[PDB]
Paper text:
C-phycocyanin (CPC), a blue pigment protein, is an indispensable component of giant phycobilisomes, which are light-harvesting antenna complexes in cyanobacteria that transfer energy efficiently to photosystems I and II. X-ray crystallographic analyses and EM analyses of CPCs have revealed that the quaternary structure of CPC is a closed toroidal (αβ)6 hexamer with D3 symmetry that is thought to be formed by assembling two trimers face-to-face. In the present study, the native CPC from O-77, namely TlCPC, was isolated and its oligomeric states were determined using X-ray crystallographic and cryo-EM analyses. These structural analyses unexpectedly revealed the coexistence of conventional hexameric (αβ)6 (TlCPC-6) and novel octameric (αβ)8 (TlCPC-8) states, even though TlCPC-6 and TlCPC-8 possessed the same amino acid sequences; notably, PBPs with C4 or D4 symmetries have not previously been reported.
X-ray crystallographic analysis revealed that the structure of TlCPC in the space group of I432 at a resolution of 2.77 Å was not a conventional hexamer but rather a novel octamer (TlCPC-8). This crystal model contained a dimer (αβ)2 in the asymmetric unit and consisted of eight (αβ) monomers to give an extended closed toroidal structure with D4 symmetry. To date, all previously reported PBPs, including APCs, PCs, and PEs, have consisted of basic trimeric (αβ)3 units with C3 symmetry; in contrast, TlCPC-8 possessed a 4-fold rotation axis that could not be directly assembled from trimers or hexamers with 3-fold rotation axes. The inner diameter of ring-shaped TlCPC-8 (45 Å) increased in comparison with that of TlCPC-6 (25 Å) due to the extended toroidal structure of TlCPC-8. The dihedral angle of the (αβ) monomer (αGln70–αArg30–βGly70) in TlCPC-6 was approximately 110°, whereas the equivalent angle in TlCPC-8 was approximately 123°. In addition, the angle between two adjacent monomers (αGln70–βPro69–βPro69) in TlCPC-6 was approximately 52°, whereas the equivalent angle in TlCPC-8 was approximately 90°. In the crystal of TlCPC-8, two octameric (αβ)8 units were stacked along the C4 axis to form a double-layered orientationally aligned structure of [(αβ)8]2, which were further assembled at right angles to each other. Consequently, the overall crystal model of TlCPC-8 possessed a unique framework with exceedingly large void spaces of approximately 100 × 100 × 100 Å3. In TlCPC-8, the distances of intraprotein PCB pairs were as follows: α84PCB–β82PCB (20.7 Å), β153PCB–β153PCB (21.7 Å), and α84PCB–α84PCB (31.6 Å). These values were similar to those in TlCPC-6, whereas the distance of interprotein PCB pairs of β82PCB–β82PCB (31.7 Å) was increased relative to the equivalent distance in TlCPC-6 (26.2 Å) because a contact area was not observed between octamers by the PISA program, presumably due to the demand for octamers to fit the unique crystal packing of TlCPC-8.
Numbering used by the authors:
A (entry chain D), D (entry chain D), F (entry chain B), H (entry chain B): 1 to 172
B (entry chain C), C (entry chain C), E (entry chain A), G (entry chain A): 1 to 162
The structure:
């Protein structure tokens, strides 16, 4: 897999170039925001249960046929499997956030996943909706100004939202 | 690519779990040292041509015969000196790669692998490049922890040639 | 599905033989206890709504904070109380399933599997449901062996949460 | 596999319903007839040899070419195999009778059996005739009023006949 | 030894667990059938001598050559009559063992094992003992489920000879 | 292993004689009290954790160095191991109670247990004390006249106590 | 035992090599976080008794039946109150162990292992201790990364009970 | 294995009490000097070959029969094996230095080493001398005040020397 530094270094090696001041400054910004990035990762993992819970609640309100008899999340087995998928996608999003690059999310999670869902009979659009609602809950937890040194985390927040939207577009 | 961050993530993934507090502490250590790492990388990239030419000249002075003896593997003409500056630039560039990535991954994959066969085939004495690296180590002008980072990766390059 | 009858038949089939006198004695025991089993199932199904609402209220009294604290996992509004009555109904319905089948199969497959992850994810304290089951156990109004059957399957539900 | 209780419980679980008084009363009737059901199973197993014998006798009278030279039940090997098939089908019928549901009979015996016979060259119609004659002999043994507390077993008898007819229709 | 109770206990001990409700139902089936089993055992033991002698005479009436032909394996003299009475006594004794134990264990262990080679070596026709057991079945004076149990294990002995 | 019927049948087979009327009467009394025996086994298994808890509470009250630093049951590891031991011994006692014979308890649980405990440094005397307290709690729960039909269970209680004392004497 | 330092050393020793710069970065992450970890440990140890008593009273206020119902597993009398205070003290003591060690090692080893069977046997509801740890988290008086570390390991204890 | 924190936590768990303020203060001082400790480990590992070379030079100067025909370090094989031994021991000393505890050095390196050397005919006394000379070279390199921030590393130097003398005493 790659992190941000590894992606820049691989692209540089392919061209046989030293890093340009653009790339140097970008990676220096990553290094200086490292503490906020660790804060985002820690806040997402420490509240993974609540993120999954809020997303699933909003989804099941929006699509109640999911949790009624005949629904695709009705029995205990299907419900637990659905929550497992939610936490899996969230875990790979946290991986991508720590890495600063979506390589691990695509290669180890998103690839072939739409085909897997369409073979299992799981509504990919509903999974994508749940992923978006996970995005909303996770951004709400990340930007919560309580108990943290005040600052601007809008760049990290947009990066995390991009990872979530990439996850959602891979199954819809 | 092998980096401390990617190793942390792969350890988390093998066990199918979220990142533990220990792995977060490790990645925090990487981030904390990355200030010195990027300082050293920026310095070595700005002073690129100066350091390359100075190291070439250091090798030439330390080994005078490389500017006198005829032969394609020596630097007695313009072609040899261009090739030598290019080689030293390769070394320094990959060292900056390692400094940026935070580990020996780039040096292991982009430089060291196959280096011995390249040197044996073209009759390039590794001690030439050891001396070039020693000059770069003694004349980057860095101080403190950026100097220490640059030194560890230059030394890692030196050990591969030894 | 795992039932005593299906287990007897599978034991007979693995050895490719007819049902032995021992397996007939076992199935006779199942049939003999099935009178109390069906009595308890019919009672728990008729008094369904009464027992569900009584158990919800028992949990609310025993744990007053579940009717006061704000939060989606609590029952401080109408949505929470509807969800809680629905959960207790799920528990009771699957318990009647087990009573009908004559074994823990329905409880193992339809309720207990994945229950811990459901409770951890949505922050539903298992002790709430333990108290609900204790109320249902103390207020089904059954006597004798039907009471004993209902009690064994309610207790099996309790042990899963413990 | 399923027994009667398991089938009703699975159908209830799929709909997310409590059992209706219909299903409760049906299963209570099964429980109260349990003793007669055990009597039917015990009488069929304890006289499996005589059931197979009477059925095969009637069949071989009806179709004598089966046990003449060139017949499909002529040699000792073929005859023993035919009796083995008779006892196999009877054993799975007894399974279904004890279970109060034909699931074990279909899944572990009847499925793919017509294809197996047509690949082996065994006359499926003759097997079906023998199965019907087994049905007649087994009902005669079940309804025999001697040595048993007198009562009505007509419901069990129709159930057993349905299992036998299901077995016969799977090979004809 | 192989009894229903020991089999249930062994099933529970293999899984290193307490006894389940299914197993308790099966053991209750054994206990409920044990009333008839013990009545049949008591009857067959009290009327043991009458049953043995009647069975021997039934064998003689059905196969008269056994009383007529000379040879050690026949009952033409008193020694043969006594050996045959002893044999039928062994059969009945072990059938009562099985009624007591509640399974075919004692019959599988004390009688049927090696029975075939015993009868082959001493030229004893199994149909003799089949007829003796048929007489015992027809003349034990039991009615109902006690008779059903006695006939279950007597037919089990009959099928071991066929 | 043996149950009561199996032990009597083995002793009668080794002598080659029919069961005397005494043995028949004893086993018929076992059959008559079978429902009481099932009640005892059911109450002891479904209250197993309560029995272990009461015994352990008493044992730690009178030997408090067991749950104090340096005690053989202080840490979570050794505490859980002691509770596992008591639940194991109670389980084998319920086995013997269902069987009406101590052979399973002797052969599968008690034989060699004192050697195990003295090789481990586990004080066998306190294990025996805990077993006796398990006996007291179990008999209290079995003799509880509520929720059950009134009757005499003194013989069954004495048999269960004999099993408990056999267990306590095998490690004391 | 399982500490970040011991894990790095074991990784280096498995490959029979000196410590790498990645491992030294990870150990530096541990050392930089250890300041907050030690501040949190010191605070929780100094205010140990106040925190224990406050957590017990919070449990009582939230689950009042624990002070009212008779039975050995409750805190209706002084013995129960003292047992509960001792338990919360064990929890807090081991949480400080983990803060000192810098990992979940002590919590995995000294508390969580066997905790489930302990609580099942003595009928102690895990939600009691969850509420106690929530109080401790809300009342340790730490601010910043020391509070973050304390809450990390307290939530680790909370999730072991859920 | 143990580090300093782990050793203290084990000794406090075995007594069942919180850490006294003394132990807290000692471990906090370890944390404060952690950067010095990392400096010592880094300097000892990145100068390992120089340390081994200096020690070996001194050892062969004062015991020259080691590198003379018939000496236990004469041929290329035995010379390389001696250098491997010294690098191994220095590596385990750096392990103990990072851990702040000698448990790894004792358990994984020193335990049984004297028996190995005397079975091999390797003179343990000269091995101990070489270890002491490694100590001198390593401490010289660690205390070098150039290229580093001025400060007191006397406690760390004493700890490292204690590890070196523990190693030398295990083979002497
Ligand atoms: C964006 C999510 C919010 C935000 C972020 C923010 N945090 C800090 C300061 C610090 N964050 C850390 C975090 C960690 N260090 C570690 O080792 C680990 C893993 C174990 C973590 C998670 C630290 C140490 C600091 C410094 C001390 C402090 O508390 O300040 C800042 C300010 C400093 C900086 O940005 O570099 C910011 C901005 N603040 C918000 O308002 C966002 C909602
Ligand atoms: C229908 C096949 C015929 C019939 C059935 C019938 N039987 C009974 C009464 C009883 N049947 C049993 C049978 C068993 N108990 C066991 O444990 C086992 C397996 C080891 C068996 C096979 C028992 C115990 C009884 C009760 C005692 C008795 O003999 O009565 C009845 C009457 C009671 C009822 O139906 O519940 C009936 C009707 N009678 C016929 O005429 C049919 C031909
Ligand atoms: C409380 C009762 C006392 C005590 C108990 C204690 N036991 C052990 C460890 C072991 N216990 C057993 C016993 C059995 N294993 C079996 O399979 C069976 C029956 C089939 C039995 C009876 C064994 C084998 C062990 C060692 C292996 C293991 O732990 O599984 C311990 C742990 C001792 C230790 O960790 O060093 C303890 C503490 N402790 C007390 O204080 C009470 C007197
Ligand atoms: C001494 C322990 C107490 C006592 C025992 C007692 N039990 C019964 C009667 C019954 N016990 C049961 C329980 C079961 N039957 C089963 O098949 C199973 C396995 C699932 C169980 C658990 C049953 C069904 C009966 C019969 C129905 C009834 O309610 O009686 C009695 C009654 C006397 C008898 O032997 O029939 C007694 C006395 N009763 C006490 O008061 C003692 C404290
Ligand atoms: C110089 C220091 C002295 C000396 C050294 C010498 N050593 C050996 C051979 C061996 N050395 C070891 C030691 C270790 N193996 C391990 O794994 C570890 C730590 C985990 C240690 C400390 C062993 C096991 C051997 C034997 C197997 C091997 O060689 O790998 C030799 C070679 C002896 C021979 O070839 O006969 C030598 C020469 N020699 C001197 O003169 C110095 C006093
Ligand atoms: C005694 C050995 C000599 C001494 C030690 C000393 N070191 C420091 C301060 C620092 N040392 C480092 C080195 C590292 N930090 C890391 O995370 C890693 C792993 C990659 C390493 C190798 C760092 C970063 C610092 C802080 C920055 C700085 O330049 O100070 C000090 C300073 C005092 C302190 O404890 O902070 C000292 C004294 N200095 C000497 O003069 C001794 C000979
Ligand atoms: C300068 C220190 C001394 C020296 C230089 C010299 N080098 C070469 C020719 C080659 N150098 C390389 C090295 C690399 N190519 C790679 O991709 C990498 C990895 C990043 C390395 C390290 C190679 C492969 C060649 C041959 C092919 C090529 O030209 O690229 C020469 C020319 C020798 C020749 O025969 O062409 C010279 C002169 N010689 C001196 O005297 C300097 C002291
Ligand atoms: C009542 C005892 C307490 C309580 C109730 C409560 N429950 C929920 C939400 C959910 N309950 C479940 C449980 C199950 N679904 C199944 O299929 C099965 C197996 C049969 C079980 C056990 C689930 C999955 C959810 C979430 C999804 C859904 O709504 O179906 C809530 C709502 C929490 C939320 O975030 O939506 C509540 C309030 N809370 C209390 O305070 C009562 C004391
Ligand atoms: C590491 C990468 C990885 C991924 C991504 C993954 C997903 C995944 N989800 C599955 C099932 C499932 N996934 C769901 C989820 C859903 N049902 C709904 O109604 C919702 C829309 C949604 C929850 C938000 C369900 C219900 C199943 C079970 C399907 C079934 O049993 O019929 C399955 C196959 C069956 C199973 O394992 O249970 C896979 C492989 N497994 C992996 O290893
Ligand atoms: C558990 C489910 C199961 C079934 C159902 C089963 C049936 C079965 N019967 C077979 C053969 C046979 N079956 C018959 C039976 C018949 N011939 C006649 O004339 C009659 C119509 C009829 C007797 C009523 C014969 C003769 C064979 C042997 C075919 C041959 O040898 O050519 C064979 C393959 C060859 C063999 O095994 O001997 C199978 C698999 N085996 C199983 O395991
Ligand atoms: C429980 C296991 C067991 C069995 C089954 C058993 C049977 C048995 N019966 C025997 C003899 C005999 N059994 C008979 C009985 C018969 N001949 C007739 O004509 C009658 C019709 C028929 C009675 C049904 C006779 C006549 C002998 C003596 C044959 C001889 O001595 O060669 C013998 C030869 C050894 C001996 O004399 O004891 C054995 C082993 N012994 C055992 O330990
Ligand atoms: C560190 C590993 C470890 C743990 C976790 C531990 C817990 C523990 N708490 C116990 C008792 C107890 N714990 C409580 C506490 C509670 N009851 C209430 O109502 C309160 C709300 C609640 C406090 C949160 C009580 C009342 C008891 C006594 C119950 C009894 O004696 O049966 C017991 C039974 C043995 C004894 O008395 O010591 C154990 C093993 N012991 C250990 O070595």
């Amino acid at each position: 897999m790659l992190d941000a530094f590894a992606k820049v270094v691989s692209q540089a090696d392919t061209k046989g170039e030293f890093l340009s001041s653009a790339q140097l400054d970008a990676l220096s910004n990553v290094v200086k925001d490292g503490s906020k990035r660790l804060d985002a990762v820690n806040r997402m993992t420490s509240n993974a249960s609540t993120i999954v819970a809020n997303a699933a609640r909003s989804l099941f309100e929006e699509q109640p046929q999911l949790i009624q008899p005949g629904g695709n999340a009705y029995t205990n087995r299907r419900m637990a499997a659905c929550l497992r998928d939610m936490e899996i996608i969230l875990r790979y999003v946290t991986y991508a956030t720590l890495a600063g690059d979506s390589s691990v999310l695509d290669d180890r999670c998103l690839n072939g996943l739409r085909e897997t869902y369409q073979a299992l009979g799981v509504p990919g659009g509903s999974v994508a909706a749940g992923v978006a609602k996970m995005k909303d809950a996770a951004i709400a937890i990340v930007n919560d100004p309580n108990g943290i040194t005040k600052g601007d985390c809008s760049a990290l927040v947009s990066e995390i939202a991009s990872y979530f939207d990439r996850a959602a577009a891979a199954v819809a | 690519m092998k980096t401390p961050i990617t190793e942390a993530i792969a350890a988390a993934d093998t066990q199918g779990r979220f990142l533990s507090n220990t792995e977060l502490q490790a990645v925090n250590g990487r981030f904390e040292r990355a200030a010195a790492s990027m300082e050293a990388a920026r310095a070595l990239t700005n002073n690129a041509q100066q350091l390359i030419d100075g190291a070439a000249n250091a090798v030439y002075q330390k080994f005078p015969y490389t500017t006198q003896m005829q032969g394609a593997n020596f630097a007695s003409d313009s072609r040899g000196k261009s090739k030598c500056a290019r080689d030293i630039g390769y070394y320094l560039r990959i060292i900056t790669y390692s400094l940026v990535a935070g580990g020996t991954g780039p040096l292991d994959e982009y430089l060291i692998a196959g280096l011995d066969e390249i040197n044996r085939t073209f009759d390039l004495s590794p001690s030439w490049y050891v001396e070039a690296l020693k000059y770069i180590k003694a004349n980057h002008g860095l101080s403190g922890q950026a100097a220490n980072e640059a030194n560890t990766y230059i030394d890692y390059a030196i050990n591969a040639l030894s």
